[PDB]
Protein backbone atom coordinates (compact mmCIF):
# COMPACT_ATOMS: atom_id res chain seq x y z
CA UNK A 1 0.00 0.00 0.00
CA UNK A 2 3.24 2.20 -0.17
CA UNK A 3 2.93 1.64 -3.61
CA UNK A 4 -0.67 1.89 -4.57
CA UNK A 5 -0.50 5.24 -2.91
CA UNK A 6 2.17 6.79 -4.67
CA UNK A 7 0.04 5.84 -7.47
CA UNK A 8 -0.01 9.14 -9.49
CA UNK A 9 3.25 10.62 -9.53
CA UNK A 10 2.86 10.94 -13.45
CA UNK A 11 -1.12 12.58 -13.62
CA UNK A 12 -0.63 16.05 -15.01
CA UNK A 13 -2.14 17.58 -11.59
CA UNK A 14 0.96 16.13 -9.10
CA UNK A 15 3.77 17.30 -11.54
CA UNK A 16 2.40 20.80 -11.57
CA UNK A 17 2.56 21.21 -8.58
CA UNK A 18 5.94 21.39 -6.98
CA UNK A 19 7.83 19.31 -3.72
CA UNK A 20 9.33 20.93 -1.13
CA UNK A 21 11.74 18.78 0.65
CA UNK A 22 14.51 20.36 2.63
CA UNK A 23 17.09 19.13 5.41
CA UNK A 24 15.30 20.86 8.66
CA UNK A 25 17.14 24.06 9.68
CA UNK A 26 17.18 23.68 13.58
CA UNK A 27 16.08 27.37 14.42
CA UNK A 28 14.73 29.22 16.89
CA UNK A 29 11.63 28.25 16.02
CA UNK A 30 9.55 31.61 15.42
CA UNK A 31 6.49 31.15 13.61
CA UNK A 32 4.16 34.03 11.40
CA UNK A 33 1.06 32.43 11.52
CA UNK A 34 -0.30 32.36 14.80
CA UNK A 35 0.05 35.03 17.86
CA UNK A 36 -1.08 33.26 21.04
CA UNK A 37 0.55 33.50 25.06
CA UNK A 38 3.66 31.85 23.71
CA UNK A 39 5.63 34.97 22.76
CA UNK A 40 7.16 33.47 19.52
CA UNK A 41 5.44 35.41 16.72
CA UNK A 42 7.91 36.82 14.98
CA UNK A 43 6.68 40.13 13.84
CA UNK A 44 6.91 40.67 18.11
CA UNK A 45 10.18 39.39 17.95
CA UNK A 46 11.64 41.59 14.91
CA UNK A 47 10.45 44.92 16.48
CA UNK A 48 12.33 43.54 19.75
CA UNK A 49 15.22 43.41 17.38
CA UNK A 50 15.18 46.92 16.56
CA UNK A 51 16.93 49.37 17.49
CA UNK A 52 15.36 52.34 19.71
CA UNK A 53 13.95 54.73 17.63
CA UNK A 54 13.86 52.92 14.32
CA UNK A 55 10.33 51.87 13.91
CA UNK A 56 9.63 55.98 13.82
CA UNK A 57 12.36 55.86 11.05
Not at 3 to 11: G, P, W
Not at 20 to 32: A, G, H, M, R
Request: overall charge positive; glycine content about 2%.
Amino acid sequence: AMYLNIKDEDTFNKTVVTNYWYPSPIKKYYTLYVRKHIPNNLVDELEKLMKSGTLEK
